[PDB]
Motif scaffolding. Structure first.
Motif, short mmCIF file in Angstrom:
data_model
loop_
_atom_site.label_atom_id
_atom_site.label_comp_id
_atom_site.label_asym_id
_atom_site.label_seq_id
_atom_site.Cartn_x
_atom_site.Cartn_y
_atom_site.Cartn_z
N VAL A 1 0.75 -1.43 0.08
CA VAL A 1 0.55 0.19 -0.10
C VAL A 1 0.85 0.92 -0.15
CG1 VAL A 1 -1.40 1.80 1.07
CG2 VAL A 1 -1.62 -0.97 1.11
N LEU A 2 0.93 2.46 -0.69
CA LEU A 2 1.29 3.35 -1.10
C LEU A 2 0.81 4.57 -1.04
CD1 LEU A 2 3.46 2.36 -4.68
CD2 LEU A 2 3.66 1.20 -1.90
N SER A 3 1.00 5.57 -0.74
CA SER A 3 0.06 7.01 -1.03
C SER A 3 1.38 7.46 -1.72
CB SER A 3 1.27 7.08 1.12
OG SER A 3 -0.14 6.89 1.11
N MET A 4 0.43 8.15 -2.96
CA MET A 4 1.15 9.11 -3.93
C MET A 4 0.55 10.44 -3.70
SD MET A 4 1.07 8.50 -7.97
CE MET A 4 1.63 9.56 -8.88
N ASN A 5 1.63 11.51 -3.65
CA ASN A 5 1.04 12.64 -3.82
C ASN A 5 0.31 13.28 -4.44
OD1 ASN A 5 2.50 16.29 -4.42
ND2 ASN A 5 3.71 15.55 -2.04
N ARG A 6 -0.75 13.91 -4.29
CA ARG A 6 -1.72 14.19 -4.76
C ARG A 6 -1.84 15.43 -5.44
NH1 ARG A 6 -7.43 15.14 -5.16
NH2 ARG A 6 -8.35 16.64 -5.12
N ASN A 7 -1.03 16.83 -5.00
CA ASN A 7 -0.15 18.09 -5.95
C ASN A 7 0.15 17.97 -6.97
OD1 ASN A 7 2.06 19.46 -5.52
ND2 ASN A 7 0.64 20.99 -5.02
N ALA A 8 0.89 16.94 -6.67
CA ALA A 8 2.02 16.28 -7.79
C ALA A 8 1.57 15.01 -8.98
CB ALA A 8 2.94 15.24 -7.80
N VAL A 9 0.80 14.66 -8.41
CA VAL A 9 -0.62 14.17 -9.89
C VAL A 9 -1.46 15.57 -9.97
CG1 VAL A 9 -2.68 13.03 -9.65
CG2 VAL A 9 -0.71 12.09 -8.84
N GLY A 10 -1.24 16.26 -9.52
CA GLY A 10 -2.58 17.64 -9.82
C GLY A 10 -1.40 18.00 -11.20
N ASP B 1 -2.37 5.53 -30.20
CA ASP B 1 -2.50 5.43 -29.10
C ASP B 1 -2.54 6.11 -27.78
OD1 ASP B 1 -1.59 2.42 -30.68
OD2 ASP B 1 -0.08 2.34 -28.78
N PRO B 2 -3.99 6.03 -27.07
CA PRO B 2 -4.24 6.63 -26.14
C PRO B 2 -3.32 6.45 -24.80
CG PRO B 2 -5.87 5.55 -26.67
CD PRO B 2 -4.90 5.33 -27.46
N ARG B 3 -3.52 7.52 -23.78
CA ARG B 3 -2.96 7.51 -22.39
C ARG B 3 -3.44 6.29 -21.31
NH1 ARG B 3 -1.90 13.36 -20.48
NH2 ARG B 3 -0.72 12.56 -19.33
N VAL B 4 -4.85 5.73 -21.94
CA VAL B 4 -5.97 4.95 -20.88
C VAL B 4 -6.38 3.87 -21.83
CG1 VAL B 4 -7.36 6.73 -20.46
CG2 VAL B 4 -7.34 5.06 -18.83
N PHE B 5 -6.73 2.76 -21.35
CA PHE B 5 -7.98 1.78 -22.49
C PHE B 5 -8.45 1.90 -22.03
CE2 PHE B 5 -3.23 2.13 -24.03
CZ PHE B 5 -3.51 2.20 -25.06
N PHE B 6 -9.54 1.39 -22.39
CA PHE B 6 -11.22 1.06 -21.48
C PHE B 6 -11.40 -0.80 -22.76
CE2 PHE B 6 -10.86 5.78 -20.85
CZ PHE B 6 -11.05 5.99 -20.03
N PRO B 7 -11.43 -1.29 -21.72
CA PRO B 7 -12.06 -3.01 -22.64
C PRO B 7 -13.33 -2.18 -23.43
CG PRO B 7 -11.13 -3.23 -20.34
CD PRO B 7 -11.46 -1.79 -20.27
N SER B 8 -13.51 -3.05 -24.21
CA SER B 8 -14.80 -3.20 -24.21
C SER B 8 -16.61 -3.20 -24.33
CB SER B 8 -14.65 -3.95 -26.41
OG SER B 8 -13.79 -3.74 -27.35
N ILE C 1 -3.64 6.07 -13.70
CA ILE C 1 -2.89 6.97 -14.85
C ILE C 1 -1.59 7.48 -14.72
CG2 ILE C 1 -2.53 8.02 -17.60
CD1 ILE C 1 -5.53 7.79 -16.77
N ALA C 2 -1.14 8.82 -13.27
CA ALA C 2 0.01 9.17 -13.34
C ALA C 2 0.67 8.75 -12.92
CB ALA C 2 -0.42 10.24 -12.16
N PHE C 3 -0.02 7.04 -11.82
CA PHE C 3 1.35 6.42 -10.82
C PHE C 3 2.17 5.83 -12.14
CE2 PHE C 3 2.73 1.94 -9.44
CZ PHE C 3 2.87 2.19 -8.71
N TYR C 4 1.46 5.02 -13.56
CA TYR C 4 2.22 4.86 -14.49
C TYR C 4 3.12 5.43 -15.06
CZ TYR C 4 -0.51 0.05 -14.21
OH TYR C 4 -0.93 -1.19 -13.78
N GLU C 5 2.98 6.60 -15.68
CA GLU C 5 3.04 7.46 -15.86
C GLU C 5 4.47 7.90 -15.31
OE1 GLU C 5 0.91 10.53 -17.55
OE2 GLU C 5 -0.36 9.10 -18.86
N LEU C 6 4.74 8.30 -13.96
CA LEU C 6 5.53 8.10 -13.49
C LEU C 6 6.81 7.90 -12.90
CD1 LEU C 6 3.80 12.11 -12.30
CD2 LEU C 6 5.35 11.78 -13.71
N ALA C 7 5.89 6.31 -11.97
CA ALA C 7 6.82 5.64 -11.60
C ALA C 7 6.60 4.48 -12.26
CB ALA C 7 6.01 5.29 -10.38
#
Lengths: 205, 205
Positions: free
Chosen positions: A121-130, A160-167, A196-202
């Motif tokens: 379990v991790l805590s991610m900086n909300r300001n950095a995500v903003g 290729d988008p930044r996030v995919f949603f299944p059919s 999304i931010a977790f994957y793009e930044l970490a």
């Protein structure tokens, strides 16, 4: 500063999926995203029995145990680390609520911690995500409703988008967004953006 | 009012043993008592990294998991419910610490709750325990050290004892008291007193 506690870059880059969790005073939402940026699940629920003048740990246990019973297994569970501090007394009720929620999520979602001592379990900086999504006015965040709506209802789909949603899920996700759009469930939007931010930044640096 | 949450009287009278837990900002202590009022175990933590300036859920998880790994199984785990109110802004650091401790203890000591929904962690009113042992002066609770000293070193044996120390342990409990007599060890005294009060007020009526 972005992620606490400190996880080796090795375990972060080999993530197969995460569950991103965001809660407010009234509602909680979560999103299950794999390393292909696929939204395998995305839910919100109004935990209306909490934050009613009392801080009953037994009620928090019942609510949080019910919430997590709907979550599939994931490599990491990601919560928000907000900017609230002790100095402001007017925010004491919210800060206490957030720390209780965070404490039980850390305890209940670390299902093997007592045997291996590895944090899931991790805590991610909300300001950095903003800042990552350019949602800041001053030093506070604005709504990501419009940005999520772009992901969910964009027309092009020729790159290729930044996030995919299944059919099988996209129809439900769109009906969920539109049915809750008037209520503006910010936690629903924020859980998606945090994942999304977790994957793009970490993960994919 | 005395105990929260509400438990069926059937479960309370059928108790075989309990763990009684009392924590402060610097130490935690517990006592394992069975329904014959035998002190099966009784000890306190030394020093921990909590309450040193920050509130890290990962650090709380590590500390509380280590504490719980030293505790035996019991039918119920009884925590203190203090009178600290969120309306009192001066005490919020301590109130926040207490609620994080309580939330993680509720989460981690309820090993079967997720399947049957039966609470095993209870909160017992500290003020009521105070009145039960006539420790109150005004609305403040005075130290139980005299009571515990009387319980541990009673050589008259003309009244029915309210708690029993086994022979293989009564040697260690007495030298624990004397080595700690020179230090602030109220949690140790209060954990024992709360266990006795639980049996006298909730189990045997």
């Amino acid at each position: 500063k972005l992620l606490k506690p400190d996880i080796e870059r090795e375990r972060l880059k080999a993530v197969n999926s995460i569950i991103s969790i965001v809660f407010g005073t009234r509602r909680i939402a979560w999103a299950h995203l794999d390393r292909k940026l696929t939204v395998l699940d995305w839910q919100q629920s109004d935990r209306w029995s909490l934050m009613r003048g009392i801080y009953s740990s037994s009620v928090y246990l019942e609510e949080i145990s019910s919430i997590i019973s709907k979550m599939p297994k994931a490599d990491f569970y990601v919560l928000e680390k907000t900017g609230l501090s002790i100095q402001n007394s007017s925010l004491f009720p919210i800060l206490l609520h957030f720390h209780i929620m965070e404490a039980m999520l850390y305890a209940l979602l670390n299902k093997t911690f007592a045997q291996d001592g590895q944090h899931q379990v991790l805590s991610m900086n909300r300001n950095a995500v903003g800042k990552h999504f350019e949602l800041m006015i001053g030093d506070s965040r604005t709504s990501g409703k419009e940005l999520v709506k772009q992901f969910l209802f964009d027309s092009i789909l020729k790159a290729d988008p930044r996030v995919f949603f299944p059919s099988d899920k996209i129809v439900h996700y769109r009906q969920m967004f539109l049915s809750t759009e008037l209520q503006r469930v910010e936690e629903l939007y924020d859980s998606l953006l945090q994942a999304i931010a977790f994957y793009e930044l970490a993960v994919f640096d």
